[PDB]
């Protein structure tokens, strides 16, 4: 396992440096230098905060993958809580961006009130509070074992049924619910774009709408393209748990390697907003 032992820390450190640099730059610029333009920038600020939290918690995972875990049960619980909060916050702030764009484009006459309220007093309730509440199993279950040699910092459910239940609800919520909301919103938006001669009532409003809309499409596509293979891997694993999939013992180790490598590569979602700012900031 030398290949994995050398591969994991390098990726966890590259992502860590890039996340610190990009997310710190974005947060400083849009929090103190006042470069915020519209509601999409507020949503991207919230995304940057969540990604900064996860990037801060990454080095502990790097050290854990290198040799061992010398940090403690409290730090194990903290890193698990931070990871879950970041995941559920980002995957749904994306859906809030999609809803904002749908309201802006489809109903362009009187969207100011349900475009201002939905971001000024509803984003917290819709994103952070369910994200905080979903971390109660992290408090209950996240622990540090004392197996031979190494110390393991993972979640130890009493029985495998809860393992499959938690995997299914994670997949369900964080891939399907924003997935369906984004599908509906962007299908309607794209159907509007290809048909309406002139959105709103002036050419400048039309071009502003298109220019604001496109980066969010690119961001959502990149996010889902990064996160999808990990979900495929854990879906195959869960179907291995339930007595459906059964092949030779080589399949188990192949799936373990696939899921580990793909999670390492899917942690790249934290570096998307700074990259899009770099691409579209000339």
């Amino acid at each position, epitope marked *: 396992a030398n290949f994995n032992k050398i591969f994991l820390p390098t990726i966890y450190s590259i992502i860590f440096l890039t996340g610190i640099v990009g997310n710190g730059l974005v947060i400083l610029v849009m929090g103190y230098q006042k470069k915020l333009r519209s509601m999409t920038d507020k949503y991207r600020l919230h995304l940057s905060v969540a990604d900064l939290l996860f990037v801060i918690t990454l080095p502990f995972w790097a050290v854990d993958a290198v040799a061992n875990w010398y940090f403690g049960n409290f730090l194990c619980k903290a890193v698990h809580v931070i990871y879950t909060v970041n995941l559920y916050s980002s995957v749904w702030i994306l859906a809030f961006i999609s809803l904002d764009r749908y309201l802006a484009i489809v109903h362009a006459t009187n969207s100011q009130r349900p475009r201002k309220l939905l971001a000024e007093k509803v984003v917290y309730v819709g994103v952070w509070i369910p994200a905080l509440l979903l971390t109660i199993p992290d408090f209950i279950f996240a622990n540090v074992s004392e197996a031979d040699d190494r110390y393991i910092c993972d979640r130890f459910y009493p029985n495998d049924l809860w393992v499959v239940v938690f995997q299914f609800q994670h997949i369900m919520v964080g891939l399907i619910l924003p997935g369906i909301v984004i599908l509906s919103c962007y299908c309607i938006i*794209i159907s509007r*774009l290809k048909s309406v*001669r*002139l959105l709103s009532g002036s050419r400048e409003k*039309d071009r502003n709408l*298109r220019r604001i*809309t496109r980066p969010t499409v690119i961001l959502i596509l990149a996010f889902f393209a990064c996160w999808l293979p990990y979900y495929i891997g854990i879906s195959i694993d869960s179907f291995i748990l339930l007595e459906i999939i059964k092949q030779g013992c080589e399949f188990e180790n192949t799936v373990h390697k696939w899921i580990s490598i793909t999670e390492a590569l899917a942690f790249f979602h934290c570096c998307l907003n700074p990259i899009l700012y770099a691409f579209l900031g000339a």
Partner: nanobody, 116 residues
């Protein structure tokens, strides 16, 4: 970009029938409005939905048409008058992409002369 041309002009006797043409080809994502002008005197313009907006001086006089397959617009002329001897400019509104703004266009021009 896109290319638009005009044709159908020449020396024609009064009271004859002809059909002007204006074909657009190239990086076309969608054509929205296509019309003929004569400043900018709106004499005919057919939307993609067929809701034509004829001019006041040609009310009940000119007939317009459009072939979405060939991206062409046809102007059916009939009952020529000496006051109608002018040069017509093909005008069209197009778009080069989903995220691109509305781009206007113009044609080279066609001259129609009435014998006298």
């Amino acid at each position: 970009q896109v290319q638009l041309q005009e044709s159908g002009g020449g020396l024609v006797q009064a009271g004859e029938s002809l059909r002007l043409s204006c074909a657009a080809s190239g990086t076309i994502f969608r054509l929205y409005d296509m019309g003929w002008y004569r400043q900018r005197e709106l004499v005919a313009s057919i939307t993609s939905g067929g809701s034509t907006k004829y001019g006041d001086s040609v009310k009940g006089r000119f007939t317009i048409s459009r072939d979405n397959a060939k991206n062409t617009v046809y102007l059916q002329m009939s009952s020529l008058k000496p006051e109608d001897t002018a040069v017509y400019y093909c005008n069209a509104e197009y778009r080069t992409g989903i995220w691109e703004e509305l781009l206007d266009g113009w044609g080279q021009g066609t001259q129609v002369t009435v014998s006298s």
